[PDB]
């Protein structure tokens, strides 16, 4: 959100004069890449606190 | 996340135009009728003189001594003005006017005061006898709402 | 969050009407008085002739040779016009007028110039002698603010 | 005329109250010079639908002055009163410019 | 991590002004032209009378009996108003106006109706003969978009 | 710097028409809050990589 707030006309943005709803929906890409980033670091924090025989859980 | 000030203010000016639409649309029509009235008047002179000099109402424009052709007394919103037995009727054009007033008209008629006459202004009327007219009931009268307070006269106004 | 352009512009037209209210209300009254004046005049003729031909001011309408009935010289805003010893007073109707001018009136009176007369126009007056009138002080005079610049004459104007 | 318009048609406006509606406005009726606006039932808040306000004027003598506030009824040509009934738009929803009381002068 | 409500709402009001910019800029110009028109009119009186009384169009302001100096009939957005053979042209100032209308002008001209005249309003015109004018084609005419619906008349309007 | 570059008339700014030196000096607040931010993250990166016997570092 910090690199994407360094002004206007970045990679993938819009100009600020669009209507807000369209601007927010196009960025949906980046809102999504942030949520996925969150889900991942949550997964690592939640978890974390053919040779058929090779596939069995051993001791 | 943010941009609603631009979206609401573009949509309040949009609805502001919709609220300002009927106000400008009757103010407008009421303005186009106020002229049919001005075009109708100023022809009172001819008609008055004709009556006082002869004691008979002018049968038509030519008699009254005005553009022998009704269509020659037109305007922007006025398609014409015809004198029919002292009664002067003004017709609203079809182009350049409101929407519920085009092709619609009003009348100016007078009454013998004896030595002079008095004029009336209102919805279309027909002359019956030299001192009596009646509603030209037919459906093309300019609606009361579009007529000035000074032009609300009834067929039997005295 | 947004919609203030529609709300302010509906409230500026509302306050615009409130500011345009007193302007149309004295322009209006001042217009209704300008007629009481026209109805009062044109009766100067009768009165002038009566005076020059006889050397005495017409006592009443009939003497002046006009609608023997004051009420017969009325109008839209004028409830009548009475000639009282050469003085012609015009009364404002009660319906169709301002609010602070109805039932109110003005007067037109003349003065012997000797061989001719000169007319005055102003607030109600009574005739005392053939060459003197006085304020019909009583409270029903049309307020100075509603009278034209041409009708600001005082009882002793010469 | 010196008399308040009895209804929309008299005032020379959409003879039908319902013809002066909007998105949130179900209509606008002129009742003896008093103009009341009703809030629709669909597309609005929740505590303001079917609710309304009024605009009424007062003779200034030669002109009139307008007021804006909660629903009112006209009594005489120069007096109106609260149309007390329970369907008035709540003060919190009214602009600062439309807080007028029935006896505002 | 957080603050986007302040950033977007400051940037929606910024873009709202950019969208409200061209609307206020033609509403504005269209307003500054509506006056050039009012300054042009009211001078119809002088011109009309001059024509009806003499049968010839007033050559210049002095002939029409108006501020002998064109520049004396200026305004806020109007740099002047000149009468040239009955044609009255209004010039837009250079300071205080839109941007594509300054130094630009319109004309009001009339036509013999025979006993009276009718007036037109539109883009600059020159008078050829007593009953004919033509486009003062030169590039300084106020653009059609800035002219009222009542001032869209063509050189050959009748 | 990039939120404070979203247009003009923010919280605490100036209008651009002031003389530059005064504009820059009023913002000195924000230039200062940035340097302090720097000093802090530098401190975290530098640090982060009587009984007399009781006071000695033991094992």
XYZ file of C-alpha atoms in Angstrom:
697
model
C 0.000 0.000 0.000
C 3.021 2.294 0.558
C 4.597 1.774 -2.895
C 1.107 2.024 -4.497
C 0.541 5.381 -2.650
C 3.668 6.875 -4.006
C 1.604 9.080 -6.358
C -0.381 8.310 -9.467
C 0.114 6.582 -12.833
C 2.112 3.596 -11.426
C 1.945 0.019 -12.987
C -1.676 -1.127 -13.196
C -3.342 1.999 -11.322
C -5.887 4.500 -12.441
C -5.956 8.241 -12.689
C -7.689 9.704 -9.628
C -10.484 11.441 -11.649
C -12.266 8.116 -12.420
C -15.335 7.458 -10.396
C -14.264 5.913 -7.073
C -16.135 2.603 -7.513
C -14.431 1.862 -10.853
C -11.011 2.914 -9.486
C -11.400 0.598 -6.498
C -12.664 -2.314 -8.663
C -9.734 -2.109 -11.133
C -7.252 -2.212 -8.243
C -9.082 -5.277 -6.937
C -6.007 -7.067 -8.346
C -3.803 -5.450 -5.676
C -6.445 -5.665 -2.866
C -6.457 -9.425 -3.766
C -2.650 -9.848 -3.843
C -2.585 -8.228 -0.313
C -5.304 -10.560 1.098
C -3.485 -13.596 -0.389
C -0.351 -12.288 1.329
C -2.186 -12.144 4.549
C -3.749 -15.673 4.187
C -0.282 -17.071 3.538
C 1.429 -15.537 6.617
C -1.654 -16.627 8.640
C -1.215 -20.217 7.329
C 2.431 -20.252 8.228
C 1.516 -18.946 11.747
C -1.461 -21.332 12.324
C 0.164 -24.430 10.824
C 3.463 -24.082 12.217
C 2.395 -23.156 15.681
C 6.114 -44.456 -7.814
C 7.570 -45.955 -4.617
C 4.378 -46.289 -2.531
C 6.232 -47.237 0.758
C 8.319 -43.982 0.548
C 4.965 -42.079 0.844
C 3.738 -43.587 4.150
C 4.187 -41.499 7.363
C 7.009 -43.213 9.313
C 8.000 -42.735 12.985
C -12.095 2.692 0.045
C -12.351 6.403 -0.893
C -13.880 8.210 -3.854
C -17.505 9.101 -3.065
C -17.333 12.925 -3.003
C -16.984 13.064 -6.802
C -19.641 10.373 -7.304
C -22.306 11.932 -5.049
C -21.722 15.543 -6.181
C -22.029 14.514 -9.858
C -25.260 12.724 -8.883
C -26.672 15.645 -6.862
C -26.219 18.021 -9.816
C -27.912 15.373 -11.972
C -30.923 15.205 -9.642
C -30.763 19.004 -9.200
C -31.359 19.341 -12.954
C -34.298 16.921 -12.678
C -35.839 19.076 -9.923
C -35.013 22.274 -11.856
C -36.527 20.676 -14.985
C -40.297 21.200 -14.322
C -39.695 24.692 -12.852
C -37.906 25.913 -15.998
C -40.421 23.970 -18.129
C -43.534 25.875 -16.733
C -41.683 29.120 -16.184
C -40.704 28.608 -19.773
C -44.175 27.847 -21.153
C -45.692 30.584 -19.033
C -43.167 32.839 -20.765
C -44.087 31.694 -24.291
C -47.750 32.364 -23.537
C -47.079 35.828 -22.170
C -46.058 36.703 -25.706
C -49.013 35.209 -27.478
C -50.759 37.726 -25.271
C -48.568 40.623 -26.381
C -49.072 39.691 -30.001
C -52.803 39.500 -29.428
C -52.840 42.946 -27.855
C -51.758 46.021 -29.825
C -54.395 44.804 -32.205
C -56.943 45.981 -29.711
C -56.403 49.439 -31.160
C -57.543 48.484 -34.630
C -60.487 46.520 -33.269
C -61.521 49.209 -30.801
C -61.438 51.945 -33.378
C -63.317 49.843 -35.925
C -66.069 49.183 -33.370
C -66.408 52.761 -32.051
C -66.345 54.238 -35.556
C -68.894 51.801 -37.014
C -70.731 50.139 -34.142
C -69.967 46.703 -35.611
C -67.059 44.409 -34.664
C -64.436 43.850 -37.379
C -65.238 40.558 -39.130
C -61.620 39.708 -39.917
C -58.067 41.071 -39.904
C -58.554 43.030 -43.122
C -61.672 44.654 -41.747
C -59.748 45.626 -38.618
C -57.069 46.989 -40.884
C -54.268 44.594 -39.986
C -52.109 42.103 -41.860
C -54.906 40.707 -44.006
C -53.240 37.353 -43.395
C -53.536 35.752 -39.899
C -50.201 34.048 -40.500
C -48.660 37.469 -40.987
C -49.190 38.210 -37.282
C -47.063 35.348 -36.003
C -44.078 35.161 -33.720
C -41.504 32.796 -32.244
C -44.047 30.811 -30.264
C -47.006 32.340 -32.045
C -48.118 30.698 -35.261
C -50.601 33.544 -35.814
C -53.292 35.935 -34.619
C -56.740 36.098 -36.198
C -59.492 38.637 -35.668
C -62.881 36.993 -35.876
C -65.742 39.432 -35.236
C -63.723 41.618 -32.880
C -62.368 38.573 -31.032
C -58.612 38.293 -31.414
C -57.226 34.778 -30.975
C -53.526 33.913 -30.758
C -52.239 30.483 -31.778
C -49.110 28.919 -30.338
C -46.610 27.649 -32.909
C -45.643 23.972 -32.976
C -41.882 24.503 -32.873
C -39.974 26.325 -30.145
C -42.580 25.976 -27.400
C -43.248 23.959 -24.225
C -45.004 20.728 -25.133
C -48.480 21.009 -23.676
C -49.135 24.452 -25.104
C -48.226 24.247 -28.804
C -50.980 24.622 -31.346
C -52.901 25.977 -28.372
C -54.478 29.405 -28.158
C -56.162 32.225 -26.221
C -58.521 35.106 -27.057
C -59.021 38.776 -26.382
C -62.511 40.127 -26.850
C -64.243 43.285 -25.867
C -67.592 44.532 -24.736
C -69.557 47.654 -25.535
C -69.368 50.014 -22.583
C -71.414 52.497 -24.589
C -69.110 55.233 -25.810
C -66.128 52.959 -25.193
C -65.326 49.272 -24.715
C -63.584 47.109 -22.128
C -61.214 44.267 -23.019
C -60.945 40.766 -21.625
C -58.209 38.159 -21.929
C -58.590 34.428 -21.455
C -59.180 31.029 -23.029
C -60.494 30.934 -26.650
C -63.957 32.310 -27.213
C -66.375 32.751 -30.125
C -68.592 35.762 -30.680
C -72.316 35.095 -30.705
C -73.854 38.553 -30.927
C -72.352 42.067 -30.758
C -72.290 41.852 -26.996
C -71.876 38.159 -26.278
C -69.198 35.522 -26.827
C -68.851 31.912 -25.632
C -66.232 29.296 -24.909
C -64.718 28.025 -28.109
C -64.786 24.676 -26.285
C -62.825 22.291 -28.485
C -59.707 21.148 -26.635
C -56.984 23.466 -27.968
C -57.207 26.124 -25.231
C -54.028 27.043 -23.402
C -54.293 25.485 -19.936
C -55.183 27.793 -17.071
C -51.839 27.093 -15.405
C -50.018 28.777 -18.295
C -52.112 31.924 -18.258
C -51.150 35.115 -16.368
C -53.301 36.316 -13.487
C -54.371 39.122 -15.830
C -55.709 36.685 -18.411
C -58.060 34.459 -16.431
C -61.256 35.977 -17.871
C -64.374 33.840 -18.451
C -66.659 34.063 -21.474
C -69.216 35.949 -19.350
C -66.885 38.370 -17.600
C -68.363 41.862 -17.475
C -20.587 11.821 1.977
C -21.805 13.552 -1.220
C -25.084 15.189 -2.175
C -24.957 18.905 -1.306
C -25.129 20.481 -4.791
C -28.823 19.569 -5.132
C -29.564 20.600 -1.531
C -27.881 24.032 -1.673
C -29.149 24.943 -5.173
C -32.747 24.107 -4.166
C -32.185 26.308 -1.086
C -30.630 29.204 -3.019
C -33.622 29.360 -5.384
C -35.839 29.274 -2.287
C -34.020 32.245 -0.735
C -33.818 33.895 -4.182
C -37.629 33.907 -4.268
C -37.673 35.441 -0.769
C -35.358 38.239 -1.955
C -37.342 38.622 -5.197
C -40.561 38.678 -3.131
C -40.556 42.329 -1.879
C -39.249 43.630 -5.238
C -42.141 42.061 -7.183
C -44.507 43.022 -4.339
C -43.769 46.847 -4.601
C -43.149 46.782 -8.324
C -46.491 45.061 -8.363
C -48.361 47.520 -6.123
C -46.708 50.448 -7.845
C -48.156 48.950 -11.020
C -51.694 48.624 -9.633
C -51.588 52.265 -8.556
C -50.373 53.474 -11.927
C -53.747 52.357 -13.213
C -55.868 53.963 -10.563
C -54.152 57.007 -11.984
C -55.081 56.202 -15.573
C -58.664 55.587 -14.566
C -58.697 58.868 -12.689
C -57.386 60.724 -15.724
C -59.356 60.819 -18.975
C -62.044 62.164 -16.728
C -60.081 65.361 -16.585
C -61.655 66.188 -19.931
C -65.196 66.148 -18.607
C -64.196 68.086 -15.496
C -62.118 70.629 -17.394
C -64.824 71.340 -19.898
C -67.494 71.592 -17.211
C -65.384 74.149 -15.340
C -64.379 76.289 -18.353
C -67.925 76.282 -19.740
C -69.602 77.167 -16.431
C -66.962 78.529 -14.077
C -68.050 76.059 -11.383
C -66.498 72.643 -10.651
C -68.704 69.621 -11.378
C -70.330 68.536 -8.112
C -70.464 64.847 -9.007
C -69.966 62.352 -11.836
C -73.349 63.092 -13.404
C -72.612 66.794 -13.413
C -69.284 66.098 -15.108
C -71.170 63.965 -17.577
C -69.668 60.596 -16.701
C -70.998 57.253 -15.493
C -73.466 58.700 -13.007
C -72.370 55.841 -10.766
C -68.867 55.992 -9.160
C -68.808 52.193 -9.171
C -69.262 52.305 -12.920
C -65.754 53.747 -13.288
C -63.958 50.818 -11.692
C -61.207 48.524 -12.856
C -59.178 45.466 -11.896
C -57.511 47.147 -8.940
C -59.848 50.110 -8.982
C -63.082 49.782 -7.062
C -64.224 53.142 -8.469
C -63.645 56.781 -9.364
C -65.767 59.597 -7.966
C -65.864 63.243 -8.968
C -66.507 65.435 -5.968
C -66.505 69.152 -6.828
C -64.008 68.780 -9.657
C -61.761 66.547 -7.540
C -61.512 63.065 -8.998
C -60.615 60.347 -6.496
C -59.747 56.753 -7.400
C -60.306 53.905 -4.948
C -58.272 50.717 -4.959
C -60.311 47.509 -4.997
C -59.973 44.992 -2.167
C -59.299 41.952 -4.348
C -56.426 41.582 -6.799
C -54.123 44.190 -5.264
C -50.972 44.421 -3.122
C -51.928 44.350 0.544
C -51.080 47.771 1.891
C -52.820 49.648 -0.896
C -56.300 48.110 -1.182
C -59.275 50.247 -0.292
C -56.750 53.058 -0.591
C -57.031 56.016 -2.927
C -55.593 59.099 -4.638
C -56.987 62.319 -6.143
C -56.657 64.520 -9.174
C -57.769 68.105 -8.805
C -57.299 71.212 -10.814
C -56.812 74.908 -10.382
C -58.134 77.887 -12.287
C -55.354 79.304 -14.430
C -57.827 81.863 -15.738
C -58.846 80.856 -19.242
C -57.602 77.332 -18.559
C -56.747 75.057 -15.636
C -53.774 73.011 -14.466
C -54.068 69.503 -13.028
C -52.417 67.938 -10.008
C -52.099 64.312 -8.937
C -51.438 63.053 -5.436
C -52.851 61.766 -2.164
C -56.627 62.236 -1.531
C -57.832 65.795 -1.181
C -61.123 67.597 -0.517
C -62.229 70.796 -2.203
C -62.817 73.749 0.082
C -63.520 76.613 -2.297
C -63.349 76.911 -6.104
C -59.618 77.421 -5.892
C -58.593 75.522 -2.784
C -58.521 71.894 -1.659
C -57.045 70.174 1.411
C -55.730 66.834 2.562
C -58.546 64.376 2.967
C -56.539 63.246 6.007
C -58.223 60.073 7.207
C -55.817 57.150 6.827
C -56.847 55.575 3.513
C -54.370 57.445 1.285
C -52.119 55.392 -0.957
C -48.643 55.533 0.598
C -46.124 57.849 -1.018
C -43.889 54.902 -1.892
C -46.555 53.558 -4.254
C -47.073 56.809 -6.109
C -45.273 57.738 -9.357
C -42.863 60.668 -9.413
C -45.532 62.457 -11.457
C -48.128 62.079 -8.711
C -46.411 63.478 -5.641
C -48.449 66.711 -5.557
C -49.381 68.380 -2.237
C -52.742 69.951 -1.441
C -51.195 73.412 -1.926
C -49.256 72.765 -5.125
C -49.612 75.650 -7.559
C -54.780 36.363 -6.536
C -54.212 36.950 -2.833
C -55.321 33.377 -2.072
C -53.055 30.332 -1.619
C -53.344 27.635 -4.300
C -55.673 24.924 -3.000
C -53.953 22.079 -4.835
C -51.336 21.263 -7.470
C -53.662 22.038 -10.370
C -54.503 25.409 -8.890
C -50.795 26.142 -8.537
C -50.405 25.066 -12.130
C -48.267 21.980 -11.586
C -48.572 18.283 -12.360
C -52.228 17.991 -11.404
C -51.215 14.669 -9.878
C -49.151 14.681 -6.621
C -47.616 11.379 -7.693
C -46.375 13.093 -10.828
C -43.936 15.133 -8.721
C -42.050 12.159 -7.321
C -38.422 11.153 -7.347
C -36.012 8.400 -6.347
C -36.613 8.828 -2.632
C -39.641 11.031 -3.118
C -42.977 9.311 -3.543
C -44.586 12.689 -4.302
C -45.139 16.377 -3.613
C -48.570 17.836 -2.909
C -49.625 21.461 -2.683
C -52.325 21.903 -0.084
C -53.385 25.547 0.327
C -49.979 26.934 -0.571
C -48.222 24.417 1.685
C -46.020 22.078 -0.311
C -45.347 18.718 1.342
C -42.839 16.143 0.091
C -43.268 12.442 0.849
C -40.379 10.008 1.055
C -40.759 6.867 -1.049
C -40.755 3.445 0.607
C -38.064 1.895 -1.583
C -34.515 3.178 -1.978
C -34.346 5.164 1.262
C -32.833 4.942 4.763
C -35.197 3.053 7.042
C -36.439 5.581 9.557
C -37.348 8.180 6.958
C -39.433 6.361 4.336
C -43.070 7.306 3.972
C -41.982 10.343 5.975
C -42.336 13.937 4.866
C -41.612 17.663 5.244
C -43.338 20.911 4.222
C -42.586 24.272 2.701
C -45.047 27.039 3.397
C -44.991 30.751 3.006
C -46.225 33.870 4.684
C -47.611 37.112 3.333
C -44.966 39.806 3.642
C -47.393 42.199 1.979
C -46.277 42.735 -1.596
C -44.197 39.563 -1.390
C -43.908 36.397 0.696
C -41.223 34.595 2.681
C -40.731 30.822 2.607
C -40.123 28.369 5.423
C -38.926 24.772 5.385
C -39.444 22.197 8.101
C -41.527 19.346 9.468
C -45.044 18.815 7.976
C -47.558 21.560 8.599
C -51.217 22.260 7.788
C -52.608 25.632 6.786
C -55.240 27.079 9.088
C -55.872 30.540 7.676
C -54.172 32.555 4.909
C -51.448 33.549 7.315
C -51.254 30.658 9.751
C -50.275 26.991 9.611
C -49.766 24.351 12.323
C -47.909 21.138 12.983
C -49.412 18.314 11.001
C -48.693 16.297 14.160
C -49.348 12.686 13.222
C -46.092 10.724 13.433
C -44.851 10.671 9.832
C -42.592 13.747 10.039
C -38.985 13.358 8.974
C -36.920 13.375 12.173
C -35.068 16.573 13.007
C -31.726 14.779 12.728
C -32.320 14.211 9.010
C -33.188 17.804 8.226
C -30.657 20.402 6.989
C -29.826 23.406 9.146
C -31.780 25.431 6.582
C -34.943 23.407 7.140
C -35.453 23.539 10.895
C -38.398 25.972 10.748
C -41.266 25.765 13.280
C -44.943 26.198 12.466
C -44.824 29.714 13.961
C -41.596 30.929 12.382
C -41.931 34.497 11.135
C -1.842 -0.267 6.780
C -4.707 2.251 7.160
C -5.188 5.808 5.933
C -6.919 5.748 2.528
C -10.263 7.405 3.371
C -8.610 10.825 3.692
C -6.450 10.244 0.597
C -9.268 9.118 -1.727
C -11.824 11.711 -0.532
C -9.307 14.540 -1.065
C -8.700 13.087 -4.549
C -12.408 12.695 -5.399
C -13.074 16.365 -4.572
C -10.044 17.213 -6.732
C -11.446 15.265 -9.694
C -14.952 16.566 -8.871
C -13.638 20.102 -9.440
C -12.120 18.967 -12.759
C -15.507 17.591 -13.856
C -17.290 20.694 -12.516
C -14.716 22.864 -14.328
C -16.091 22.764 -17.934
C -19.717 22.984 -16.713
C -19.071 26.212 -14.780
C -16.803 27.412 -17.622
C -19.614 27.233 -20.333
C -22.402 28.079 -17.938
C -20.169 30.977 -17.110
C -19.433 32.100 -20.682
C -23.039 31.548 -21.667
C -23.821 33.929 -18.813
C -21.361 36.622 -19.961
C -22.883 36.500 -23.438
C -26.432 36.794 -22.153
C -25.424 40.265 -21.048
C -23.793 41.368 -24.242
C -27.278 40.659 -25.488
C -28.955 42.802 -22.842
C -26.582 45.638 -23.545
C -27.271 45.299 -27.247
C -31.018 45.447 -26.654
C -32.635 48.511 -25.081
C -30.921 50.260 -27.921
C -33.496 48.744 -30.189
C -35.781 51.551 -29.069
C -33.548 54.291 -30.408
C -32.919 52.397 -33.635
C -36.567 51.478 -34.145
C -37.779 54.996 -33.621
C -35.084 56.449 -35.871
C -36.113 54.064 -38.659
C -39.903 54.521 -38.347
C -39.594 58.297 -38.080
C -37.210 58.674 -41.035
C -37.358 55.495 -43.096
C -33.558 55.203 -42.967
C -31.500 53.138 -40.492
C -29.353 55.124 -38.047
C -25.806 55.259 -39.430
C -24.119 55.328 -36.030
C -24.745 55.688 -32.296
C -25.071 59.471 -32.474
C -27.627 59.187 -35.240
C -29.590 56.703 -33.138
C -29.316 59.160 -30.284
C -27.176 57.087 -27.938
C -23.792 57.492 -26.272
C -22.047 58.965 -29.298
C -19.112 56.802 -28.242
C -19.354 52.984 -28.766
C -17.048 52.531 -25.785
C -19.573 54.395 -23.678
C -21.988 51.466 -24.022
C -19.722 48.894 -22.410
C -20.116 46.573 -19.470
C -18.295 44.021 -17.335
C -17.868 41.535 -20.163
C -18.869 44.016 -22.830
C -16.158 46.214 -24.252
C -18.800 48.153 -26.210
C -21.875 48.348 -28.420
C -21.858 50.064 -31.805
C -24.766 50.922 -34.063
C -23.780 50.598 -37.689
C -26.670 51.319 -40.071
C -29.331 50.063 -37.672
C -27.290 46.955 -36.845
C -26.255 46.916 -33.205
C -23.155 44.850 -32.448
C -21.895 44.015 -28.957
C -18.220 43.295 -28.302
C -16.997 41.098 -25.475
C -14.312 42.644 -23.273
C -10.901 40.991 -22.962
C -10.808 40.877 -19.166
C -13.336 39.135 -16.934
C -14.697 36.712 -19.527
C -14.479 33.025 -20.493
C -11.519 32.499 -22.803
C -12.992 31.563 -26.154
C -15.468 34.428 -26.214
C -13.464 37.567 -25.401
C -13.076 40.189 -28.086
C -15.931 38.280 -29.695
C -19.287 39.739 -30.643
C -22.905 39.394 -31.787
C -25.434 41.595 -33.616
C -29.032 42.679 -33.456
C -30.569 43.944 -36.655
C -34.066 44.603 -37.795
C -36.212 44.383 -40.863
C -38.905 46.633 -42.255
C -42.277 45.055 -41.620
C -43.876 48.093 -43.226
C -45.345 50.255 -40.492
C -43.151 48.479 -37.952
C -40.008 46.342 -37.800
C -39.003 42.950 -36.430
C -35.729 42.303 -34.601
C -33.245 39.471 -34.938
C -30.383 38.383 -32.702
C -27.397 36.308 -33.722
C -23.802 36.221 -34.917
C -22.285 39.490 -36.278
C -23.793 40.845 -39.461
C -23.242 43.804 -41.799
C -25.994 45.801 -43.457
C -26.002 45.775 -47.242
C -29.179 47.632 -48.154
C -32.084 48.962 -46.062
C -33.602 45.507 -45.987
C -30.623 43.183 -46.214
C -27.628 42.305 -44.048
C -24.961 39.589 -44.321
C -22.571 37.594 -42.192
C -19.754 39.768 -40.970
C -17.656 36.645 -41.601
C -14.252 37.399 -40.116
C -13.597 35.022 -37.216
C -14.575 37.066 -34.154
C -18.184 35.838 -33.872
C -19.307 34.407 -30.555
C -19.555 30.642 -31.043
C -23.026 29.188 -31.471
C -22.626 27.164 -28.280
C -22.496 30.367 -26.234
C -25.605 31.897 -27.739
C -29.099 31.583 -26.214
C -31.814 29.702 -28.080
C -33.380 33.122 -28.674
C -30.289 34.416 -30.453
C -29.624 31.809 -33.126
C -30.818 33.993 -36.027
C -29.185 33.757 -39.484
C -28.377 36.706 -41.734
C -31.403 35.840 -43.894
C -33.943 35.214 -41.145
C -37.297 36.772 -41.990
C 6.509 12.142 1.429
C 4.067 10.538 -0.985
C 0.919 11.109 1.148
C 2.142 14.678 1.664
C 2.495 14.960 -2.177
C -1.164 13.986 -2.806
C -2.115 17.541 -3.904
C -2.187 20.691 -1.697
C -4.066 21.928 1.436
C -3.582 18.700 3.469
C -3.276 18.731 7.329
C -0.436 21.032 8.441
C 0.855 22.079 4.793
C 1.039 25.386 3.067
C -0.344 26.762 -0.136
C 2.323 26.599 -2.861
C 2.356 30.398 -3.502
C 4.218 31.126 -0.210
C 7.863 31.902 -0.598
C 9.770 28.598 -0.738
C 11.907 29.193 2.377
C 8.860 29.788 4.597
C 7.000 26.787 3.063
C 9.968 24.510 3.732
C 10.447 25.849 7.302
C 6.779 25.311 8.286
C 6.944 21.700 7.068
C 10.089 21.268 9.169
C 7.673 19.349 11.436
C 7.330 16.620 8.796
C 11.003 16.733 7.662
C 11.714 16.124 11.414
C 9.178 13.278 11.860
C 10.844 11.563 8.790
C 14.416 11.940 10.177
C 13.244 10.593 13.583
C 11.743 7.680 11.661
C 15.020 7.073 10.027
C 17.050 7.317 13.310
C 14.732 4.773 14.879
C 15.011 2.128 12.115
C 18.786 2.765 12.119
C 18.859 2.146 15.922
C 16.942 -1.068 15.564
C 19.381 -2.159 12.775
C 22.615 -1.101 14.596
C 21.585 -2.325 18.055
C 20.068 -5.467 17.125
C 22.719 -6.524 14.704
C 26.854 -3.662 46.607
C 27.646 -7.265 45.631
C 30.335 -6.659 42.971
C 30.491 -10.361 41.798
C 26.686 -10.304 41.053
C 27.461 -7.549 38.452
C 30.000 -9.477 36.321
C 28.773 -11.013 33.001
C 28.621 -14.788 33.614
C 28.334 -17.612 31.042
